[PDB]
Design a protein around this ligand. Structure first.
Ligand SMILES: CCOC(=O)c1cnn2cccc(C#CC3CC3)c12
Lengths: 416, 555
């Protein structure tokens, strides 16, 4: 090893991101974690001649009662060169999203064995803050490949394919994808045998690692072949009220921006007068006709929709109440690439931000499996509330980008 | 006794730029004679060194008379070199807040002012600190000098000094956990929770530890005992407060006279409860004209007169006790004003403060209370490293109805209700379903964009209708007026059908106060109602009621 030619993008300076406040418990955990990391040579203290900074915090995944160090490398990742000299982006395995049992592994600890470019280390600087600014922030810079940096999987890509060559040859039905610090492994067999043959993949890194023991203990198991698809569905009733027909006409009007043949002329005809909202209106068979074509039109996929890897993915989320959350992933308005709903969230029946937070994580994971790219989020929450609390509930080792929606969308009811 | 060497910090210039070459200004003979005397003593102390003519860099030097004392003072204008020096990690960006200082029994301040000019400078960077003492009558070349230590006024000196001082103080703090040390400029704040006899002994130990690196601090009794004058506060041994601010009275307040006020009141609001400054800060909009003596507002003097009842008697804060819970109370003060107190036991506060509502079009008290909670939460994590427990003037059931029906995700940390009016409440709540037996009002508005003439009105299921002609209006204004007429003319329960996405967007934001008088009037109508169901339909779609009132309104 001992060679990693890596630099910054031409015309861009290193990250100078301010460290946000941390609770006492997280500062102590980071101090313990970093003290040990410094002894293992992973990080070294630095002086004031390093002006760069990247924020850090602590993450306690429910799987373990120990804290994990999360470095928010979002700004750094934008400023490092794109690693096409290694690979022009390995073709995203479309078989991943066609799999029944995909499991994720945290192979991030494997990055710590490969050293980092001596001229690049200054850009990975981070600060452990102190409470009340009573002492200067403890400053470190990484010496080996950092967890969360874009360059870490790209550099380790030469070594990662060698540890997996025997397993890939032993089972060509299994497709492996890597995103940042995660290994996405898919299989199509029973769950009891799934966890055992995943442990077979798990023991390849231990034999390579030895060349408490730091390796893999948990696997978040997904089933992307049992995921949510949300087509536009219309109500089926025997009696319709004026209000019922108003909402239907509004929904069909909205869906006419996505589907062309949607017609509402005969249903608006039913609202011929000034009736009370709860009054039952009989459906004329000419309007019942029109409702039938619209229903069949909504059965077919959206016309002229495609994925473009050059454009950004946008994820919008709506709060539907009682733990229900709807979302859409798209690049061009009304050209959705995926829609879904989340009914129940881990606890958080009294906490809206925890629900939204892990909804963002699930949507990102789904986006990684389908496209190998994280989307840009539009969040239904005041910026100050989200920014205060999302780190308390975060779990994933990556972090997406997000904006904040401050005007209540009218289309909330149409996705409900 | 050998002195341990302070390891140097490698410093470089900005990429592409060179060092400074600003020439030397002519000085009088007494100024030149004073600089030569100063620079001779500094050279004997190793701070600077004479350099040959091969150094092509220069930084202007000056001599300023010290106050009272006839002895001159030396000053280098490193402004041009600071523009070409690399960026540093500025570590003194944030200063501690007194409310976060833990309770200590004895505190001692050590002055290390000599150490600033005793920290070596990077050997490869001294060539850029060159300066010239102009000779008498300019008949010989100036005496050339370069700095060997951190120069007073250089960009990197404050950061390198603290970093160098931190590395020195690390072994002592590690081997003395009963000692808490805080560094700031040339001052060392050393406190402990033990008996005074063991305090001055460990204080003396710190002196010998500093002597190993050649840093000597005064031994005689310092002239700075509690309370201290540090960053605008008064640090008594048991309590803290701001430095007393006798805010003055004035006949004609101007722009700079109220900005002196605005700054000084916000400083006092961290310990003085109930400080309000908005009506005074309302007198600052537009350009910053220093030749404008703006008249005063009547609603700014009566609120001024309220700031005096708090600033008359001295109020103190206590120090942080980590063994007791941290509490934060909030009160609504009106017109977007919120005040808070953070405390651990009744009657005595650690600190106070205020929150000002964000400049927006529509708002309500629940949103404002939420944002204030997030603010107090972020400030508490800074100062104490934990979120406090909240006492809020809002019922548990009110908050539950708000967050479960609000379209945004929202959350506040652990909190309890405190019955201290004015209470934050929900003034209205719309229905989720149409109301049976309630009259249905179909509303619409329309304006002529050319003549600003429009109409607004409604048609109901009982044959009630109304159309009012309007002048100096817009499409958005008539849509809101229509809804207002329907509320004004209906019974206690009413269904309202509108096509205005504009109006829905406002109402679904659930404001209780608006900058628009038309929205505020709607709000006052909603408050009087029992049940209000607001339904939306798309426009220009032949929807009866809506279509039959769209024609009457756009006639
Ligand atoms: C060792 C720092 O001292 C304390 O932590 C402390 C405790 N109680 N107490 C009372 C008065 C003044 C200080 C102070 C200070 C430094 C300027 C921040 C103080």
């Amino acid at each position: 090893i001992e060679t990693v030619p890596v630099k910054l993008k031409p015309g861009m300076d290193g990250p100078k991101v301010k460290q946000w406040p941390l609770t006492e418990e997280k500062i102590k955990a980071l101090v313990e974690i970093c003290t040990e990391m410094e002894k293992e040579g992973k990080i070294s203290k630095i002086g004031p001649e390093n002006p760069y900074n990247t924020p850090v915090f602590a993450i306690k995944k429910k799987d373990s009662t120990k804290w994990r160090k999360l470095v928010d490398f979002r700004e750094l990742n934008k400023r490092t060169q794109d690693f096409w000299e290694v690979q022009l982006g390995i073709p995203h395995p479309a078989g991943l999203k066609k799999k029944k049992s995909v499991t994720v592994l945290d192979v991030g600890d494997a990055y710590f064995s490969v050293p980092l470019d001596e001229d690049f280390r200054k850009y990975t600087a981070f600060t452990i803050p102190s409470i009340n600014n009573e002492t200067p922030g403890i400053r470190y810079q990484y010496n080996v490949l950092p967890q969360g940096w874009k360059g870490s999987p790209a550099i380790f890509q030469s070594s990662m394919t060698k540890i997996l060559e025997p397993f890939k040859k032993q089972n060509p039905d299994i497709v492996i994808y890597q995103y940042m610090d995660d290994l996405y492994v898919g299989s199509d067999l029973e769950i009891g045998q799934h966890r055992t043959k995943i442990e077979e993949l798990r023991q390849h890194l231990l034999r390579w690692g030895l060349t408490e023991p730091p390796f893999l203990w948990m696997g978040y198991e997904l089933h992307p072949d049992k995921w949510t698809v949300q087509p536009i569905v219309l109500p089926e009733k025997d009696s319709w009220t004026v209000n019922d027909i108003q909402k239907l006409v509004g929904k069909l009007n909205w869906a006419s921006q996505i589907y062309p043949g949607i017609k509402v002329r005969q249903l608006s005809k039913l609202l011929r007068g000034t009736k009370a909202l709860t009054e039952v209106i009989p459906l004329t068979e000419e309007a019942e006709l029109e409702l039938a074509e619209n229903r069949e039109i909504l059965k077919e996929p959206v016309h002229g929709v495609y994925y473009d890897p050059s454009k950004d993915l946008i994820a919008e989320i709506q709060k539907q109440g009682q733990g229900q959350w709807t979302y859409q992933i798209y690049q061009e308005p009304f050209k959705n690439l995926k829609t879904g709903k989340y009914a129940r969230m881990r606890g958080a029946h009294t906490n809206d931000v925890k629900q939204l937070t892990e909804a963002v994580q699930k949507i990102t994971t789904e986006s990684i499996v389908i496209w190998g790219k994280t989307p840009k989020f539009k969040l239904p929450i005041q910026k100050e509330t989200w920014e205060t609390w999302w780190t308390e509930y975060w779990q994933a080792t990556w972090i997406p980008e997000w904006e904040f929606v401050n005007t209540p969308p009218l289309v909330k009811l149409w996705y409900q | 006794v050998p002195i341990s060497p302070i390891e140097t910090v490698p410093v470089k210039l900005k990429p592409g730029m060179d060092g400074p070459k600003v020439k030397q200004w002519p000085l009088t003979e007494e100024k030149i004679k004073a600089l030569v005397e100063i620079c001779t003593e500094m050279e004997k102390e190793g701070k600077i060194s004479k350099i040959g003519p091969e150094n092509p860099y220069n930084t202007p030097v000056f001599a300023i008379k010290k106050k009272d004392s006839t002895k001159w003072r030396k000053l280098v204008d490193f402004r041009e070199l600071n523009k070409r020096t690399q960026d540093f990690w500025e570590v003194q960006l944030g200063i501690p807040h007194p409310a976060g200082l833990k309770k200590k029994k004895s505190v001692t301040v050590l002055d290390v002012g000599d150490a600033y000019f005793s920290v070596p400078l990077d050997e490869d960077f001294r060539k850029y600190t060159a300066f010239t003492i102009p000779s008498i009558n300019n008949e010989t070349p100036g005496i050339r000098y370069q700095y060997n230590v951190l120069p007073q006024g250089w960009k990197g000196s404050p950061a390198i000094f603290q970093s160098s001082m931190t590395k020195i103080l690390e072994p002592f703090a590690a081997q003395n956990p009963d000692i808490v040390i805080y560094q700031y400029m040339d001052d060392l704040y050393v406190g402990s929770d033990l008996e005074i006899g063991q305090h001055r002994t460990k204080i003396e130990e710190l002196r010998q530890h500093l002597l190993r690196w050649g840093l000597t601090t005064p031994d005689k009794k310092h002239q700075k005992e509690p309370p201290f004058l540090w960053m605008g506060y008064e640090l008594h041994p048991d309590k803290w407060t701001v430095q007393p601010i006798v805010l003055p009275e004035k006949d004609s307040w101007t722009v700079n006279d109220i900005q002196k006020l605005v700054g000084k009141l916000n400083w006092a609001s961290q310990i003085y409860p109930g400080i309000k400054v908005r009506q005074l800060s309302k007198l600052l909009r537009g350009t910053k004209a220093l030749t404008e003596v703006i008249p005063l507002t009547e609603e700014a003097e009566l609120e001024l007169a309220e700031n005096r009842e708090i600033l008359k008697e001295p109020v103190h804060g206590v120090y942080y006790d980590p063994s007791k819970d941290l509490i934060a109370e909030i009160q609504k003060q009106g017109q977007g004003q919120w005040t808070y107190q953070i405390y651990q036991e009744p009657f005595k506060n650690l600190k106070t403060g205020k929150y000002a509502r964000m400049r927006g079009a529509h708002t309500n008290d629940v949103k404002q209370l939420t944002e204030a909670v997030q603010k107090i939460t972020t400030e508490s994590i800074v100062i104490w490293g934990k979120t406090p427990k909240f006492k809020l003037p809002i019922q548990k059931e009110t908050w539950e109805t708000w967050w479960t029906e609000y379209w945004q995700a929202t959350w506040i940390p652990e909190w309890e209700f405190v019955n201290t009016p004015p209470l934050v409440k929900l003034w209205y709540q719309l229905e989720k379903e149409p109301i049976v037996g309630a009259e249905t009002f179909y509303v619409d508005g329309a304006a002529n964009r050319e003549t600003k003439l429009g109409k607004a009105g409604y048609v109901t299921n009982k044959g009630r209708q109304k159309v009012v002609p309007l002048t100096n209006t817009t499409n958005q204004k008539t849509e809101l007026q229509a809804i207002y007429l329907a509320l004004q003319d209906s019974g206690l329960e009413v269904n309202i059908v509108t096509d205005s996405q504009y109006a829905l967007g406002i109402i679904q934001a659930q404001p209780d106060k608006s900058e628009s008088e038309l929205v505020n009037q709607i709000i006052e109508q909603l408050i009087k109602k029992e049940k209000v169901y607001l339904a939306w339909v798309p426009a220009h779609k032949g929807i009866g009621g809506n279509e039959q009132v769209d024609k009457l309104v756009s006639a």
